[PDB]
Amino acid sequence: FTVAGMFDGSLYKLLLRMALPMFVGMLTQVTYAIADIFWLSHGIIAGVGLVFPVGMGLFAIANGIQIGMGSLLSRAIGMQRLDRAQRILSVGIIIALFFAIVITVLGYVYAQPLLRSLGATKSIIGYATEFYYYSLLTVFSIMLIGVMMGLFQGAGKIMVIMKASLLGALVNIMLDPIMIFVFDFGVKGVALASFLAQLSMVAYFIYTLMGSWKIYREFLSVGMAQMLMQLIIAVGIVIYNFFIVRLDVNAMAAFTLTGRIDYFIITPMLAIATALLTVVGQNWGHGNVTRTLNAYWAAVALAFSIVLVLAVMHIVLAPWMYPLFTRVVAVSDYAVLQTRIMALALPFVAISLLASEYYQAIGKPWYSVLLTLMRHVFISVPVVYLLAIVLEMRITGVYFGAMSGTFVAALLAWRLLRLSPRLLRWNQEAV
Ligand SMILES: C[As](C)(=O)[O-]
Ligand SMILES: [Rb+]
C-alpha cells in the first residue's frame, strides 16, 4: 500500500521509480508481435488481420476499467480508508463482469453486420467469423486483466505489473513453438499461446493478490471517460487519413511507415502518465493539492525532456532511415517531410496528455475529455481545412494544421493546472 516516498519524497525519484517498471512492462508487449511473426515464418488464414481491430477495441475498454480502478482506489488509499478500497475492488470487479457479458452477447448477435463493416468475404470470412468468435472468448479474461492492472497500479505496486509482464512474454515465447510443432495447431496455435500467456498474467496477479450508485457512478464516469478519449483519438487518426489519402496516396503510404516509430517515441510519456495517476490520486486523497500540482509539473519535465530527445533523433535519423524502407521516393520523401515538420510537436503532447491524467486522478474527467478534444478535433479540423484546401498548401497544410491543436491544448493545460479556489474547494468537498 505504502509506496515509499509518495507524500514527503522527491517527486522525480518517486515518478521515475514507478515509471520505469511500467516501461519495461510496455516493452515486453512488443515481444508478442516479434516472437509471433518469428514462429509464423514456419495468404488464406490471413483474415486473422481482419479481426485485429476488435482486439484493440477490447483493450481500450480494458484500459477504461484500469484507470477507473486506479483512479478510485488510489484516492481511497490516500484518505486512508481501506474500506472504500475493498468496496471499490468489488464494484470494479462487477463492472468488469457486466462489461464482459453485454460485450460478448451483443457481439455474438450482431456478429455478421460487424464483420461486414470490417473486411470483404470473396476469400476470407469463415476464417474471419471463426476468429471473431475466439476473440469474443477472450473478453472476460481481458476485463479481468484490466481490473488487476488498476488494482496494483492504484496501490502503487508496479513491480508486480512488470513481473507479470515478463512472465507473460516468456510463456508466449515458449508455447508458440510447442503449439506449432507438438500440437500442429498453426496460426490458431500462436493465438492460443498468446491467450494462455495473458492468463498466466491474471494467474500471477491473483496469486500475488492472495496475501451504492454513487460509487458505481464514480467508477463508471472515470472509466467511460477513458474509453471516450480512446475513441476520440481513434477518430483523429481517421480524419487525418481521410485528408491525406484524398490528397496524395503516397502521403498515406508514408504515414503507414512512420506510425510505429511515432508511437514508440510517445510511449515513455505514457509510462510517466501511469505513474502520475497514482501519485496525484494518493496525494489528492491525502488533501495535499500543492504536491499534486507539483507532481504534474515534475512529470511534464521528465516526459518533455525524454520525448524531446527522441523526436530530435527521429529527425536526424529520418532522411537516412526512410529511403531504406521503401523504393517509392515521394513516399519516403513525404515520410521525411512529415517527420521534419511534425516531430517537435511531440514533446508538447506531454503537457495536454499528462493534464488529462491529472483530471482523471482527481475524478474530474470532463476536463480530460475536453483537453483530448482540444488536441484532436476542435482546432486541427478547421485549420487543416483552411491551410490544405482553402489556402492552396496541400499535404503540407495537413502536416501543420494537424499539430496546431497540440499546441493549443498545451496552452490550456498550462492555464488550468495551478492553485485556484475551484481546485482547492474540489479537494475539500472530496475529503
Ligand atoms: C460547480 As463546481 C463542481 O465546477 O465547483
Ligand atoms: Rb500525431
Which helices and strands appear, and what pairs or packs with what?
Elements: H1 11-39, H2 52-78, H3 84-109, H4 111-116, H5 126-137, H6 139-154, H7 158-181, H8 187-209, H9 213-247, H10 249-285, H11 289-321, H12 329-342, H13 349-361, H14 366-378, H15 380-390, H16 395-416, H17 421-430
Helix pairs in contact: 1-7, 1-10, 2-3, 2-6, 2-9, 2-10, 3-6, 3-9, 6-8, 7-8, 9-10, 9-14, 10-11, 10-12, 10-13, 11-12, 11-13, 12-16, 13-14, 13-16, 14-16, 15-16
Bound molecules: cacodylate ion and rubidium ion.
Give the DSSP E fraction (strand runs of 2 or more residues): under 5%
Q: Which kinds of small molecule does this entry bind, naming each only once?
A: cacodylate ion, rubidium ion
Q: What is the number of helices?
A: 17
Query: What is the total number of structural domains?
Result: 1
Q: Tell me the total number of β-strands.
A: 0
Structural class by SSE content: mainly alpha
Q: What pattern of helices and strands is seen along the backbone?
A: HHHHHHHHHHHHHHHHH
Outline type? globular
Q: What is the radius of gyration?
A: 22 Å
User: What percent of residues adopt helix (DSSP H or I)?
Assistant: over 70%
First-last Cα distance: 20 Å
Oligomer type: monomer
Q: How is the main sheet built?
A: none
